[PDB]
Amino acid sequence: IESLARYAVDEHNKKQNSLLQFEKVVNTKQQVVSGTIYIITLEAVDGGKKKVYEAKVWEKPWMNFKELQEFKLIGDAPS
Amino acid sequence: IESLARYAVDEHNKKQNSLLQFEKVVNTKQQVVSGTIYIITLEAVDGGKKKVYEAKVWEKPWMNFKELQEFKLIGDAPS
């Protein structure tokens, strides 16, 4: 687990140009999670131009939960 | 599934002050995912001050994968 903590600190430093020096783990909780990712390609109209988007939705139905993880423009729809 | 797509577009609009008008789903892929979230509380030294951080690590060992999901300062460590 200390291995996972050192990784987390490494990643944070790598990502935000930090220099946190890992000392010790003081507490760990862990949850096993399942669910379904939906990668939905959809057309939507943006101020009159029909465009194509990809949305990543994470759904955990065993706890009645969902959330939008990613939303990105793919390009224009054909016309 | 159209329900999930309308949700995704609603959330994107809600989050980035957009007005995308959902038209239709054109393609859906879905993946069932499991794994373990680790919420690791750790001490690390930031320029000489020992502080306390909470890191959220998602691990999917069935595909030899992990990633840092959140990293936040909790406060100072006791001195």
Q: Where are the domains of chain B?
A: 1-79
Q: Is the CB of A41 less than 8 angstroms away from the CB of B27?
A: yes
| Residue B10 DSSP SS3 | helix
CB < 8 Å to A4, chain B:
38, 40, 57, 59, 66
Q: Is the CB of A34 less than 8 angstroms away from the CB of B31?
A: no
Find the Cα–Cα–Cα–Cα dihedral A46, B1, B33, B58, rounded to 10°: 40
Name the nearest CA neighbour of A37 among B57, B58, B14, B70: B58
Q: Is the CB of A42 less than 8 angstroms away from the CB of B5?
A: yes
The DSSP secondary structure of chain A, one letter per residue, reads -HHHHHHHHHHHHHHHT---EEEEEEEEEEEEEEEEEEEEEEEEEETTEEEEEEEEEEEEGGGTEEEEEEEEEEEEPP-
Q: What is the C-alpha separation between A58 and B54, in angstroms, rounded?
A: 23
CB < 8 Å to B30, chain A:
36-39
Residue A49 contacts residue A68 (beta carbons within 8 Å): no
Smallest CA–CA separation between B50 and chain A, in Å?
8
What is the experimental resolution, given in Å to one decimal place? Answer: 1.8
Q: What is the C-alpha separation between A47 and B4, in angstroms, rounded?
A: 22
